Amino acid sequence: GLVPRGSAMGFDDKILLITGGTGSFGNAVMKRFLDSNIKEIRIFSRDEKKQDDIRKKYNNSKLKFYIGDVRDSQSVETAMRDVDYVFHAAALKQVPSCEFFPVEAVKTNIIGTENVLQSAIHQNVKKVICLSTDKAAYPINAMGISKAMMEKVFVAKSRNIRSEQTLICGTRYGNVMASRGSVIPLFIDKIKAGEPLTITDPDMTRFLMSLEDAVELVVHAFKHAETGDIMVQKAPSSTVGDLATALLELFEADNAIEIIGTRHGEKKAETLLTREEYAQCEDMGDYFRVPADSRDLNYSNYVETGNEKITQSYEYNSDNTHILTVEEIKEKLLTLEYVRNELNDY
Amino acid sequence: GLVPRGSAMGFDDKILLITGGTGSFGNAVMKRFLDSNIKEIRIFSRDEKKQDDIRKKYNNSKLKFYIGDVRDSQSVETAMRDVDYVFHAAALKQVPSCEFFPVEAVKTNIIGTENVLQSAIHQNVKKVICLSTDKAAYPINAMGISKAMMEKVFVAKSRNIRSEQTLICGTRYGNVMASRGSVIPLFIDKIKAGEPLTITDPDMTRFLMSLEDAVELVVHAFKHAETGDIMVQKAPSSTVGDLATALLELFEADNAIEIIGTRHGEKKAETLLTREEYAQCEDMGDYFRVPADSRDLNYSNYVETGNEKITQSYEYNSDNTHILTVEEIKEKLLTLEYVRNELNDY
Amino acid sequence: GLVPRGSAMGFDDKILLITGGTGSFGNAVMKRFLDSNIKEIRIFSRDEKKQDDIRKKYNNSKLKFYIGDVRDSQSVETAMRDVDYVFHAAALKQVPSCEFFPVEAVKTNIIGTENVLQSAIHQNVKKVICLSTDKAAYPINAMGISKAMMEKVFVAKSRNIRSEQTLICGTRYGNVMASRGSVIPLFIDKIKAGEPLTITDPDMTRFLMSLEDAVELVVHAFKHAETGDIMVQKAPSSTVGDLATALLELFEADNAIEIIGTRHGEKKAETLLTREEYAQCEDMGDYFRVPADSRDLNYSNYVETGNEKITQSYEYNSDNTHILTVEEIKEKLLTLEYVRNELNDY
Amino acid sequence: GLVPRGSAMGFDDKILLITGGTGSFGNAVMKRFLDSNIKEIRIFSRDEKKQDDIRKKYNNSKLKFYIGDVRDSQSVETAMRDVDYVFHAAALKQVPSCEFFPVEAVKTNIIGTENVLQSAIHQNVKKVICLSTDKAAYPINAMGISKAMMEKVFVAKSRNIRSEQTLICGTRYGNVMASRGSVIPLFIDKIKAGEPLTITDPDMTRFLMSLEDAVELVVHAFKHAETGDIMVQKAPSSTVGDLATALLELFEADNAIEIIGTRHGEKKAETLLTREEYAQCEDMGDYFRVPADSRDLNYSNYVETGNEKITQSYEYNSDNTHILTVEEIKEKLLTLEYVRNELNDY
Ligand SMILES: NC(=O)c1ccc[n+]([C@@H]2O[C@H](COP(=O)([O-])OP(=O)(O)OC[C@H]3O[C@@H](n4cnc5c(N)ncnc54)[C@H](OP(=O)(O)O)[C@@H]3O)[C@@H](O)[C@H]2O)c1
Ligand SMILES: NC(=O)c1ccc[n+]([C@@H]2O[C@H](COP(=O)([O-])OP(=O)(O)OC[C@H]3O[C@@H](n4cnc5c(N)ncnc54)[C@H](OP(=O)(O)O)[C@@H]3O)[C@@H](O)[C@H]2O)c1
Ligand SMILES: NC(=O)c1ccc[n+]([C@@H]2O[C@H](COP(=O)([O-])OP(=O)(O)OC[C@H]3O[C@@H](n4cnc5c(N)ncnc54)[C@H](OP(=O)(O)O)[C@@H]3O)[C@@H](O)[C@H]2O)c1
Ligand SMILES: NC(=O)c1ccc[n+]([C@@H]2O[C@H](COP(=O)([O-])OP(=O)(O)OC[C@H]3O[C@@H](n4cnc5c(N)ncnc54)[C@H](OP(=O)(O)O)[C@@H]3O)[C@@H](O)[C@H]2O)c1
Ligand SMILES: CC(=O)N[C@H]1[C@@H](OP(=O)(O)OP(=O)(O)OC[C@H]2O[C@@H](n3ccc(=O)[nH]c3=O)[C@H](O)[C@@H]2O)O[C@H](C)C(=O)[C@@H]1O
Ligand SMILES: CC(=O)N[C@H]1[C@@H](OP(=O)(O)OP(=O)(O)OC[C@H]2O[C@@H](n3ccc(=O)[nH]c3=O)[C@H](O)[C@@H]2O)O[C@H](C)C(=O)[C@@H]1O
Ligand SMILES: CC(=O)N[C@H]1[C@@H](OP(=O)(O)OP(=O)(O)OC[C@H]2O[C@@H](n3ccc(=O)[nH]c3=O)[C@H](O)[C@@H]2O)O[C@H](C)C(=O)[C@@H]1O
Ligand SMILES: CC(=O)N[C@H]1[C@@H](OP(=O)(O)OP(=O)(O)OC[C@H]2O[C@@H](n3ccc(=O)[nH]c3=O)[C@H](O)[C@@H]2O)O[C@H](C)C(=O)[C@@H]1O
Ligand SMILES: CC(=O)N[C@H]1[C@@H](OP(=O)(O)OP(=O)(O)OC[C@H]2O[C@@H](n3ccc(=O)[nH]c3=O)[C@H](O)[C@@H]2O)O[C@H](C)C(=O)[C@@H]1O
Ligand SMILES: CC(=O)N[C@H]1[C@@H](OP(=O)(O)OP(=O)(O)OC[C@H]2O[C@@H](n3ccc(=O)[nH]c3=O)[C@H](O)[C@@H]2O)O[C@H](C)C(=O)[C@@H]1O
Ligand SMILES: CC(=O)N[C@H]1[C@@H](OP(=O)(O)OP(=O)(O)OC[C@H]2O[C@@H](n3ccc(=O)[nH]c3=O)[C@H](O)[C@@H]2O)O[C@H](C)C(=O)[C@@H]1O
Ligand SMILES: CC(=O)N[C@H]1[C@@H](OP(=O)(O)OP(=O)(O)OC[C@H]2O[C@@H](n3ccc(=O)[nH]c3=O)[C@H](O)[C@@H]2O)O[C@H](C)C(=O)[C@@H]1O
Ligand code: NA
Ligand code: NA
Ligand code: NA
Ligand code: NA
Structure with a gap:
């Protein structure tokens, strides 16, 4: 289910927004929550064709299709009004196209994520889960580098925003x-x-x-992440x-x-966890949780205090x-x- | 000297712009070219205090001090008019401050570099050398990630801009x-x-x-880089x-x-060269040159053709x-x- | 062919840019010019998936794939450098999606066209052909209204830009x-x-x-339009x-x-020609050409002088x-x- | 009066903002509410001369004069703080000037309206009435097309904003x-x-x-429109x-x-009502009300379900x-x- 053992919520008054909602995960994630109590699933993307295909195949009055672009804060704000949960899956994710057009990868994957977070926070969204990739750990290509930087941006926002206002976390998968x-x-x-x-x-x-394992990882973060966490499926x-x-x-x-x-x-x-992430992570079992470090803007963690557990660890790859x-x-x-x-x- | 063996240029009609011109390298690089024929060295930065200190210490009518910000294309354009050469050294370079404020690292180090390149190209600058860091190879912190992305951006611009219009390259040092x-x-x-x-x-x-070795690496790139190259000093x-x-x-x-x-x-x-960079690099002797790959937007290099020299190589660290x-x-x-x-x- | 009877050009040094290059016309238009001497066809759109599909099906080294967005003038400028001809086909073209998100239709179809024209003019493009629709004549839905306004914008630019600098025209089809x-x-x-x-x-x-008739109309405009013309196929x-x-x-x-x-x-x-357009049009045979009126900003044509041919005409529908x-x-x-x-x- | 039969409000604590407040309607509308209990009438426009003329003629301490531009969201926000009601009358409304400068018509009439709506919503304005024109129905010139698109934009905003937050409607007159x-x-x-x-x-x-009939139509909308309505005076x-x-x-x-x-x-x-608007309208007597269709983003109204009343109707002209x-x-x-x-x- 979509809810931890020993909880219930009922999503009967809840609205899920999926940016990049027409792509492979957006759809699998969409089709998971259609299997739920959720009041409304808004599919947000730029592409009217892919949206019309999905609409017509599902014919489900829970599904609402918003045209807009994570690059444009006004267009995000329209789709974000009254939203409870956001799965942020919009991205330029192909290696060669990011490598030749890296400024487009920075506009969509990095600036586009900051616009989604800022709008979610203004609109009092409860949770935003950002999708990332093992290519963001020790990255070598422009696509992984932009995703690594997206992770730093959502982790940094989580330090300055209270969890009870908007919880912000992400998932990295293989x-x-x-x-x-x-x-x-x-x-x-x-x-x-x-x-x-x-x-x-x-x-x-x-x-x-599998794609199904990838949807479970997002659901796992939805249920259990704390703000600033990166969740990885072993x-x-x-x-x-x-x-x-x-x-x-x-x-x-x-x-x-x-x-x-x-x-x-x-x-x-x-690599799914760098040396440092592994040193800091908690083993949830089939997942690792990497909590955000230095949540109070603790410079001294980077400058004057160290951690011998980091020296002793190695990366998970x-x-x-x-x-x-x-x-x-x-x-x-x-x-x-x-x-x-x-x-x-x- | 500032000129290859078997050449001369005379910089007697030439103008050098140094972004981040008040910081440690900008100054050492500045003080190197003061030892030259150069018509004018423009020091471009945001800080009027550091600029006044330098002015007063050197009292050299070659030095011109421009207030401006790489984040602002108009302010770059003012300083870039009639420039022949650019050493782009403006950056947020401290680890903790990029890690807590990564959107500021993206505005200065990534978007600020694209503004400098765009203005240099519009103004017919001959050469732009972008300074980078070994923290950009397999990077793990927001500062190195932003510098890795800056490198992808200047490499991507070099593919689409003819060398004879503006040559664009960078240096990575330890x-x-x-x-x-x-x-x-x-x-x-x-x-x-x-x-x-x-x-x-x-x-x-x-x-x-040493800092002096760092200035030599920039001069080496100034003299010998081809557009798109990353130059590293062994x-x-x-x-x-x-x-x-x-x-x-x-x-x-x-x-x-x-x-x-x-x-x-x-x-x-x-790491100074990743596995892939080492496989592709030319040994210049005390330097490696990493030429830009796939200069014609050759997708098939990322998708359908491989290089066994990459499989056979390892990173330089x-x-x-x-x-x-x-x-x-x-x-x-x-x-x-x-x-x-x-x-x-x- | 792509060239009037009694001419030749050879497109052997020429570069065609197709915005919205991955959609149905972009492709048919692309596949027409692949049947030519053209040096390079750049396909410009936002979608890396559709671009990769096309690349892999054609394997043709004439085809270059640019990621970018007509909404963003920098991203257009990258793809427009050295271009000779532009077929501007990027658009939000579905009725319901424009009706519910008309600000997105204004950003893509109206502002996105002005960015393409401005960049084409800065880059000395020879010709830009803008695709429009019979839904723009007496329009009733947000998609047709945005396309009607796009036509006014490209017609207005043609009055203030010399033909020899950049010729700007459009096509409307059924x-x-x-x-x-x-x-x-x-x-x-x-x-x-x-x-x-x-x-x-x-x-x-x-x-x-047919789609083939639609490509012929674009080719007809490419060969014969004058700046400011709207070309319609009977x-x-x-x-x-x-x-x-x-x-x-x-x-x-x-x-x-x-x-x-x-x-x-x-x-x-x-309607393919309004009453006024029909009154002003020249019959080219299988086409009508609607020339731009009041090319010198002749206010008096709207205010103090009339045309009895308009009173006598009716719309073509x-x-x-x-x-x-x-x-x-x-x-x-x-x-x-x-x-x-x-x-x-x- | 300004209040339906069987109501009262007292406008004694209320603030009216009139964009384009110095033009002919703004003034007639202004002079109507001066005949009222209203606490403050803010006149918002770009022109300091016309504002000074009005100030000096009326000498009425209810009138406040704000300099600002609907194109600029900050300047609108200053004038919109604490406002209850907005009559949005700012526009480029002359045919030839919109036809030659249609991008200016899009900036003022379309984007300027979206800025007014966004600011009114942020400031918790109760009602915004947008002025439009019969030239927006089946439009043929850039001025009517921009006004038709403005109507689509305010109708689209009304679908996504609750009436109790901000009610958004418009008037079209002859x-x-x-x-x-x-x-x-x-x-x-x-x-x-x-x-x-x-x-x-x-x-x-x-x-x-008459102008007086035009002010009554605005007052009629002020009193009786529902969010998303277009009101037309027969x-x-x-x-x-x-x-x-x-x-x-x-x-x-x-x-x-x-x-x-x-x-x-x-x-x-x-035309004052298109075929479709007439089919959907309610006859209020001396007015028609055209309610917004598909308020839940009901794509299927444009795609798979029809209305035989539309087929049976014709336009009101x-x-x-x-x-x-x-x-x-x-x-x-x-x-x-x-x-x-x-x-x-x-
Ligand atoms: N291979 C994998 O599946 C894999 C592995 C690891 C991580 N991930 C990550 O998981 C996420 C989704 O994966 P996926 O496989 O579902 O990718 P995908 O199918 O390409 O879907 C991502 C969606 O992003 C939307 N999009 C792109 N730019 C956008 C923008 N500027 N504004 C709004 N929407 C935009 C696109 O839809 P429109 O064209 O309709 O806008 C696209 O369908 C991405 O962040 C990716 O980085 C994927
Ligand atoms: N440890 C090292 O020295 C080292 C190692 C490897 C690479 N690097 C790289 O080499 C470059 C310079 O190194 P450095 O040690 O000389 O650094 P530095 O002394 O900090 O100098 C960089 C200069 O950047 C300027 N700057 C920052 N933001 C700017 C903006 N937005 N617009 C214009 N100017 C701006 C600052 O001067 P104002 O305050 O006057 O604006 C600063 O003095 C940097 O790119 C750094 O990444 C340095
Ligand atoms: N039914 C018809 O075919 C018909 C009839 C009359 C007129 N037209 C007009 O002819 C043109 C193309 O028709 P078509 O049938 O080929 O349409 P289409 O297949 O939807 O293609 C248009 C292309 O626009 C691209 N696009 C959308 N927004 C963009 C942006 N912001 N930046 C860059 N590219 C963008 C999309 O590709 P990405 O998703 O890859 O960005 C899409 O494939 C449109 O202007 C349409 O108005 C079509
Ligand atoms: N013939 C008609 O009267 C008629 C018929 C149908 C519909 N309408 C519509 O009703 C509205 C007002 O009609 P009207 O006859 O009162 O027009 P008007 O006298 O021209 O007044 C409109 C006012 O718009 C203001 N304005 C223009 N651009 C603006 C901007 N960017 N920001 C803020 N204010 C701006 C101008 O005042 P400043 O120069 O002081 O900025 C102008 O006085 C318009 O929307 C028009 O479309 C008029
Ligand atoms: C170039 C490119 O588009 N890479 C996209 C891709 O990223 P990955 O490379 O991880 O996936 P793959 O399925 O292609 O490689 C699997 C393994 O098979 C090997 N591989 C692959 C192709 C082949 O012909 N032979 C081969 O051995 C290959 O070296 C590797 O060891 O997939 C996702 C969707 C993306 O985000 C990227 O844009
Ligand atoms: C999974 C479980 O319940 N095993 C517990 C049991 O451990 P195991 O016997 O499984 O051996 P290990 O932990 O040494 O390495 C296993 C793999 O993990 C990865 N691993 C491990 C260490 C590291 O620094 N980095 C890392 O990626 C790497 O992929 C490596 O190959 O004892 C240690 C001390 C624990 O805390 C475990 O929870
Ligand atoms: C945290 C921080 O500000 N790092 C800045 C810095 O990057 P680096 O870390 O590479 O340099 P350092 O001179 O500090 O470390 C040298 C070695 O000594 C070790 N080191 C360092 C301090 C110490 O007390 N003990 C120690 O062993 C340390 O683990 C390492 O092995 O210097 C440049 C200027 C920057 O860009 C970064 O912001
Ligand atoms: C410097 C010189 O003139 N030596 C030439 C002579 O080489 P050497 O005897 O020096 O041994 P090596 O090249 O194997 O490794 C040396 C170091 O380089 C780095 N190196 C090497 C290989 C690699 O994939 N990556 C890498 O970083 C790494 O730091 C490693 O420890 O023969 C080979 C084939 C050459 O082409 C050389 O130019
Ligand atoms: C709603 C929608 O998406 N309209 C898209 C569309 O615009 P048009 O409406 O012109 O095309 P169509 O092929 O749908 O109608 C043909 C005729 O058959 C009639 N029609 C259509 C469907 C039906 O079930 N029954 C029917 O009689 C219909 O009333 C009409 O008389 O096609 C292009 C691609 C678009 O740009 C628009 O987004
Ligand atoms: C095509 C040809 O060579 N015929 C020439 C021959 O004309 P025809 O005998 O064809 O009759 P018409 O022109 O009256 O109407 C035909 C259709 O055109 C459209 N048409 C016509 C007039 C108008 O105002 N608007 C319009 O759309 C409308 O679809 C209408 O049903 O003489 C006139 C004066 C010409 O100039 C023609 O070039
Ligand atoms: C060109 C222009 O500026 N049109 C502005 C205008 O829009 P309308 O055209 O509707 O108004 P008018 O009073 O001018 O025409 C009345 C009728 O008399 C006819 N008319 C007009 C002038 C004339 O000399 N002779 C004549 O017969 C004319 O053909 C028509 O049948 O008025 C408002 C204020 C605007 O928004 C427009 O910018
Ligand atoms: C006004 C009143 O109380 N009359 C009622 C009485 O109608 P009337 O005898 O007035 O004739 P009509 O309605 O046929 O056409 C009149 C004018 O309206 C316009 N009208 C009408 C239909 C249409 O589709 N579009 C339209 O614009 C057009 O300008 C046309 O010339 O019966 C019908 C069925 C009603 O519902 C009315 O409320
Ligand atoms: Na927090
Ligand atoms: Na080049
Ligand atoms: Na002209
Ligand atoms: Na509503």
């Missing part, structure tokens, strides 16, 4: 299995096309999680060399593998979590209805 | 020995005060370079445990060492350069007139 | 057969679903044209009552028709063009490969 | 007899000058109303051919008539109201003290 354009659909299309599998670096690792990882084998064996196929090399903008492994076996990758692959349909169809 | 507030003056003050040396993590490493490093010993032996002092632990916002070692011995640290320490004066005086 | 969401796909889906055809007002008329029309019959007979189907009534925001017939017979509608329907495939498949 | 520069003073001046009457199109019709009309005869017979004059032809930017007849006889035009002309004085004086 690689969503079978994202549009991502490596699983790519490889399947190569299997079916009779093409070789283009492997970048077979020993490269990525955290592996996740296993796969090497690309093993993921490709898993798919080949499942599809009973003997397409060759071709090594194309590491592409620009990519790391060998992804896709090399040091459980790296799945080919068998495990297969089982996890088979929980996806995308893989099943393609499989049956093959 | 820890400047005996910066205001930095660990060498701190430890000396503890030596002289009879206080214990507060060591954060004795095995922490930082690249070690540098040795010290552990903090060894730097403290070097100072203690020099000062013939037996203050105790106290371990305070790693402070927030700090890494164990600093303060653990894997030459880590100096206590003896070496001492010799390097003694090249500083700050250390000498304090030493004699002790 | 209902594109088999647009996403439009009545032909709707009715086909009802045919195939066994559902009744929902007819709004069977005697309602709309101009009928077109026949259908009643909805007749279009529905045409589809039923083609699909050899006897789904019932249900009258739902006129929807909000709709006219009984659409979907009731007074050739209204096609069911047979004609069928023949025109069959020129569409969308209709053919659906037909065969049925 | 041709005010003996406006500065309008056809009645023009013709009188020709009568007195011995010049021929320049008639544009003698069969052209315009709604005829009105008879005159042909220009008949108005000219009426004036000639009254002035016992035989100046010839010259036909100059229809001028740019003019329709043959003006100056051809289909009561067209007055020459005798009627004369009687109505004689109710004007402007006509009387000119008449006696002749």
